[PDB]
């Protein structure tokens, strides 16, 4: 694509600069270019990809929610609906781009648990974002695609990673959100968050001070959700 002529290392360097400049659209385009070079991504690189697109789609989702709220209160000419649709289509396109990178070919080359879980979690998240705005004939299939990705990620994480691993924890946090917000399964959400929290607590004794800080941060986010849901 447009980044085809730039060195991989230059793309990663520019992604880091774009992060510092809070230029997340540029950051995402740089990381897309890096992925399209065809090499596997390191841990640091995977996190740059994730930060870039989470910020892009996060803005789009926030805008969509504002507009959807206005549209629902209006139910006046076609403008609110048209503009909500425009933002929706742009959001769908970003989700499709990320899903495209994971399918071509990040997931299939990811053999280590840390990489494969990370990418399947991302796959679940971006189908979840598609689900948030879906209404048509494919909505159930979209939800099932998110569910399937999260479930594969969970199965690997349980086999291959300790209960305190931040990826394992963040995956459980977001799958529990999927259950509560998308799948109409609050009990499943609560169970998953509480079992994840408890199993992590029991493994904290194995951790260094730095690892402890990472794990307990995510555990507190699980607890915050449990407090909100109960």
């Amino acid at each position: 694509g447009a980044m085809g002529s730039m060195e991989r290392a230059s793309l990663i360097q520019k992604a880091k600069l774009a992060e510092q400049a809070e230029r997340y659209e540029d950051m995402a385009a740089f990381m897309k270019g890096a992925v399209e070079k065809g090499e596997e991504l390191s841990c640091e690189e995977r996190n740059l990809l994730s930060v870039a697109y989470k910020n892009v789609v996060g803005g789009q989702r926030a805008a969509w929610r504002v507009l959807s709220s206005i549209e629902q209160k209006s139910n006046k000419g076609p403008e609110v609906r048209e503009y909500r649709e425009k933002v929706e289509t742009e959001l769908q396109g970003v989700c499709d781009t990320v899903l495209g990178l994971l399918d071509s070919h990040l997931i299939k080359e990811a053999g280590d648990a840390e990489s494969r879980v990370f990418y399947l979690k991302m796959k679940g998240d971006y189908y979840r974002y598609l689900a948030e705005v879906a209404t048509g004939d494919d909505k159930k299939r979209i939800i099932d695609s998110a569910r399937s990705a999260y479930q594969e990620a969970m199965d690997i994480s349980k086999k291959e990673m300790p209960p305190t691993n931040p990826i394992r924890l963040g995956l459980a946090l977001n799958f529990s959100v999927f259950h509560y917000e998308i799948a109409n399964s609050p009990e499943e959400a609560i169970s998953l968050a509480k079992t994840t929290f408890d199993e992590a607590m029991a493994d904290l004794h194995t951790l260094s001070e730095d690892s402890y800080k990472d794990s307990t941060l995510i555990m507190q986010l699980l607890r915050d959700n449990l407090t909100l849901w109960t």
Binding site: N55, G58, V177, Y180, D224, N225, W229
Partner: peptide
């Protein structure tokens, strides 16, 4: 909406 993992 409930909070997911932040960045």
């Amino acid at each position: 909406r409930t909070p997911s993992l932040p960045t």
